[PDB]
DNA sequence: CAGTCCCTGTTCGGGCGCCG
DNA sequence: AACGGCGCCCGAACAGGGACTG
């Protein structure tokens, strides 16, 4: 006979045709078994557990760690197994909240709810399904099997339950306060108003005492009444925050595991701390599958994660969102793919920051890789603030209006102007749009063998100039590459390039300013040098000009 | 006072399991007001983390209009139970609704929350109100009434709407009605003053039973289609003609009496490409057949009601768009083209989704289906921007291609 | 006409950061 | 040695289209 808690139950079910867990404990040391025997006895008095016998055949291992900053232990209970017969979950969670997106407030408070997952009960016909048993002695006493009334912490169901349960809670409080925000993350609830200090407390205490008659406790322990709050990891201040100090390993020999943690913080940290890189040091967590394996840093990585100590010196901050002033979005380009922004409301008052640098794609360019930030940027703000910031791009209009209207696939960026900062974001070549009179033409060819891997590459002109060259080890698409590079190689400032090559002529065509291939990086640095160049296609094996010449040479 | 119909999902298949989208403050504001109004009224109820379904809701506005209107994003739901508004209670299609002079389409899907959901299927009808920078949790509902959006919908109501429009039909036997989602499409040869009479009427008969003041008109008798041209120029260039061989040989997957034999001819040796080549006798002769070819309608091309349409679409340039409508390749039901569509010379995105909506309407009045559309665009570009200029009620399937232009085909 | 190859794209799962 | 959420950068597995070979 336990009492009922106010809090309405959640209905959990399993999946059909499964039945509960049966899983044998394990082995711990003397250490944990004199910190859940006394958690499991005042638990028991408290309603939060009752006790079972042999009609319940199930059995699951619990384990217990230190709470973080505090003498108390934390209890829980590995329902790996049971996790996998209980029936799915859709998270009510869709995100973390940044403070960057918080309002100015005259009055904050930061609660805790304390016994968090052990105040919301668990389904009535679903108690059953959490047995576990809890030795006094290692090897000595059997002990007496108990069972869960509320929500055990290590169950894939205990967060959303709760999620939902608090939100239940606070709707009829919210609905008499509404002046009041009430930011919920799972326990810890942020609470702002723009009331006086003492007002402020008032209605503070009349949500303590609100939650409280649902059993829901905030002790006077993390109760936060005064600036610096701790806040979802941030220092909240009454017109300023700042991420919590972040400390960066420094060990004189480096290993991968220790760059994955070492590139983890830099990102966390770019989030307000403008200009960090993780390039050249990602770019060592690439080919060795060792986490063990120690990783001398290059000379790139040397310099990037020197520049990145040096920025994370000084002390930054962010200003918090005032929604009668526009959002701006400014975005540098810090070179190999690299892309840095900020956004403010007031110059130099930084909401946030962050980086892009993702490279997708074997071949693209810089007004591309832009368009991706700025797309970035835009799903980023309408999370934080539900809006597009206006952006202020290192790209001309003129730039941009010659992309995206001569460019095949729609594209598009949002409300921006540009700014004068270099390095500026420009196209590095052109291919004319009808063939260049006086311009040598070009009919270009490339031919592999599948079995031998052997090819050849090269070109015939209407001047009479000829190339064949002999390729070992290469494929059909990159000796049309390759006749490519060669016609551009041998040709004036200005020529005309007929080929059949679909696979050569589409990567042209956008014009990329970087790849992945060596090959293709050549033809782009031959591009520049051009005046003028005309791409035109042909079907292939038609009898079509000079490409039926060339066709014969290298096949 | 209603018997809810049961629905059951397709054999083997579960709900719809995809995740909301964010959503920008007007549109969260907007689908707030609304829901409190639609639990008030007892068309939505609040649910918990126990239904491990949902599908994505946004805010659109259609054209020329001030006021939200709660989109759900059923397409999963949808093909999720294709064997009920298809096999089970199917609405049939009128073939001449497309030969009509005027086509007036009416949003009727407020009439639907008047009929209850199966209690079994109200579980698939979830979907979760985000939060501005996750102030608080998802905000989870489920309907209790037929759903806006849902292709259910209008087969559960199609007997219920029937003998509502059963006194219009026996006044007006030449008018065509057809049913679509929440739309309603009201076809008459009537001149543009008793069309729209014979509208306000209809609107009348459904108000004796919040967007039924509004009515897109169209004129499926004014829709035209694209064929292939060909240049005609005074001189030819070797460039020109190696375009045009290019342009006939890919054309020849279509219409197979095409010959470049001609043609082709003209190109012998490696000339330069801006050489004039003037046009022997027999390459004017092949020419101008090719362009009769081109007339012609192509051989074994008709509509097949059980194989699925295609929509390709092309960005030809400043402000021009073309489309084909197949169900097999180089098997075209329709081809058309776009210019000055708004958005024109200044966004790609608003214009690609009028396109979409103007092909997708069009579908719907000449074959009752909508077409999954292979659109020329990046999924990250497309899923950005798309809702801010979406202003239908339904939405279409679609795919994300990226084909450069070799030829131009469907616009020299 | 199939069956491959070459090439490039997306999807997903795990590594890390961080929150509770 | 547990659960859920979000972000990044990574690689393996998979899909799809031109193009060549039997
Ligand atoms: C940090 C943490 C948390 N949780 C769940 C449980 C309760 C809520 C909040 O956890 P908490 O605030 O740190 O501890 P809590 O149970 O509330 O008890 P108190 O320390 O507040 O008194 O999240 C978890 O399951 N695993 C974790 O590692
Ligand atoms: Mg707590
Ligand atoms: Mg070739």
């Avoid at chain 2, 905000?139 to 959006?149: E, H, M, S, T």
């Avoid at chain 2, 289609?225 to 061989?245: A, G, H, R």
């Avoid at chain 2, 200044?346 to 292979?374: C, H, M, R, Y």
Wanted: proline share 7%.
């Amino acid at each position: 006979m336990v009492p009922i808690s106010p809090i309405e139950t959640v209905p959990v079910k399993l999946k059909p045709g499964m039945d509960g867990p049966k899983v044998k404990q394990w082995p711990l040391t003397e250490e944990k078994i004199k910190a859940l025997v006394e958690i499991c006895t005042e638990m028991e008095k408290e309603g939060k557990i009752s006790k079972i016998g042999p009609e319940n055949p199930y059995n699951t291992p619990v384990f217990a760690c230190k709470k973080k900053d505090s003498t108390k232990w934390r209890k829980l209970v590995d329902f790996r197994e049971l996790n996998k017969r209980t029936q799915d979950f859709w998270e009510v969670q869709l995100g973390i909240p940044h403070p960057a997106g918080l309002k100015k407030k005259k009055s904050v408070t930061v609660l805790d709810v304390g016994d968090a997952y052990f105040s919301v009960p668990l389904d009535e016909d679903f108690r059953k399904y959490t047995a576990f048993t809890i030795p006094s002695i290692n090897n000595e006493t059997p002990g007496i099997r108990y069972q869960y009334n509320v929500l055990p912490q290590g169950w894939k169901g205990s967060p959303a339950i709760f999620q939902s349960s608090m939100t239940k809670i606070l709707e009829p409080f919210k609905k008499q306060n509404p002046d009041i925000v009430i930011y919920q993350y799972m326990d810890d609830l942020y609470v702002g108003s723009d009331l006086e200090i003492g007002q402020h407390r008032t209605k503070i205490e009349e949500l303590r005492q609100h939650l409280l008659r649902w059993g829901l406790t905030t002790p006077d322990k993390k109760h936060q009444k005064e600036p610096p709050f701790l806040w979802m990891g941030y220092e909240l201040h009454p017109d300023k925050w700042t991420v919590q100090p972040i400390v960066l390993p420094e060990k004189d020999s480096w290993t991968v595991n220790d760059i994955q943690k070492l590139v983890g913080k830099l990102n966390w940290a770019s989030q307000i701390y403008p200009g960090i890189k993780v390039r050249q040091l990602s770019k060592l967590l690439r080919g060795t599958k060792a986490l063990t394996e120690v990783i001398p840093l290059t000379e790139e990585a040397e310099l990037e994660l020197a520049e990145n100590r040096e920025i994370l010196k000084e002390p930054v901050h962010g200003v918090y969102y005032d929604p009668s002033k526009d959002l701006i979005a400014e975005i540098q380009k810090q070179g190999q793919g690299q892309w840095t922004y900020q956004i403010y409301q007031e110059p130099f008052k930084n909401l946030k920051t962050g980086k892009y640098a993702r490279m997708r794609g074997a071949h693209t360019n810089d007004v591309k890789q832009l368009t991706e930030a700025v797309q970035k940027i835009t799903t980023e703000s309408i999370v934080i603030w539900g809006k597009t910031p206006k952006f202020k791009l290192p790209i001309q209009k003129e730039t941009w209006e010659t992309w995206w209207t001569e460019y095949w696939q729609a594209t598009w960026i949002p409300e921006w102007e540009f700014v004068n900062t270099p390095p500026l974001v420009k196209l590095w070549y052109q291919l004319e749009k009808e063939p260049i009179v006086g311009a040598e033409t070009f009919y270009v060819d490339g031919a592999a063998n599948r079995e031998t891997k052997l090819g050849k590459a090269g070109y015939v002109t209407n001047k009479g100039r000829q190339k064949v060259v002999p390729l070992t080890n290469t494929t059909n698409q990159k000796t049309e590459l390759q006749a490519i590079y060669l016609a551009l190689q041998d040709s004036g400032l200005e020529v005309n390039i007929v080929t059949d090559s679909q696979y050569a002529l589409g990567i042209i065509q956008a014009q990329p300013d970087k790849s992945e291939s060596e090959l293709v990086n050549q033809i782009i640095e031959q591009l520049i040098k051009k005046e003028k160049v005309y791409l035109a296609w042909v079907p292939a094996h038609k009898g079509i000009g000079g490409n039926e010449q060339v066709d014969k040479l290298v096949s | 006072p209603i018997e809810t119909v049961p629905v059951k999902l397709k054999p083997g298949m579960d709900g719809p399991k995809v995740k909301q989208w964010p959503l920008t403050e007007e549109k969260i504001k907007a689908l707030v007001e609304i829901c409190t109004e639609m639990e008030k009224e007892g068309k939505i109820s609040k649910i918990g983390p126990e239904n491990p379904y949902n599908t994505p809701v946004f805010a659109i506005k259609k054209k020329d209009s001030t006021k939200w209107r709660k989109l759900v994003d059923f397409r999963e739901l949808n093909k999720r139970t294709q064997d009920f508004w298809e096999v089970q209670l199917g609405i049939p299609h009128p073939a001449g609704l497309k030969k009509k002079k005027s086509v007036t389409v009416l949003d009727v899907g407020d009439a639907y929350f008047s009929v209850p959901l199966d209690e079994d299927f109200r579980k698939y009808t979830a979907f979760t109100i985000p939060s501005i920078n996750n102030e608080t949790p998802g905000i989870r509902y489920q309907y209790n009434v037929l759903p806006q959006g849902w292709k259910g919908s209008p087969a559960i109501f199609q007997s219920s709407m029937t003998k509502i429009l059963e006194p219009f039909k026996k006044q007006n036997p030449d008018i065509v009605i057809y049913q679509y989602m929440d739309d309603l499409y009201v076809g008459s040869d009537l001149e543009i003053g008793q069309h729209r009479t014979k509208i306000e009427e209809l609107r009348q008969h459904l108000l004796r039973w919040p967007f039924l003041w509004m009515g897109y008109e169209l004129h499926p008798d004014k829709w035209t289609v694209q064929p292939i041209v060909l240049p005609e120029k005074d001189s030819w260039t070797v460039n020109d003609i190696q375009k045009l061989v290019g342009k006939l040989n890919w054309a020849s997957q279509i219409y197979p009496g095409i010959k470049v034999r001609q043609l082709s001819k003209l190109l012998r040796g490696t000339k330069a490409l801006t050489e004039v080549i003037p046009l022997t006798e027999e390459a004017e002769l092949e020419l101008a057949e090719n362009r009769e070819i081109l007339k012609e309608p192509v051989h074994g091309v008709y509509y097949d009601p059980s194989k699925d349409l295609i929509a390709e679409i092309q960005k030809q340039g400043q402000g021009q768009w073309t489309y084909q409508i197949y169900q097999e390749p180089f098997k075209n039901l329709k081809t058309g083209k776009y210019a000055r569509m708004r958005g024109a010379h200044t966004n790609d995105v608003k214009q690609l989704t009028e396109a979409v909506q103007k092909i997708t309407t069009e579908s719907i009045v000449i074959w009752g289906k909508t077409p999954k559309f292979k659109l020329p665009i990046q999924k990250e570009t497309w899923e950005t921007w798309w809702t801010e200029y979406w202003q239908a009620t339904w939405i279409p399937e679609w795919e994300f291609v990226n084909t450069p232009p070799l030829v131009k085909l469907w616009y020299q």
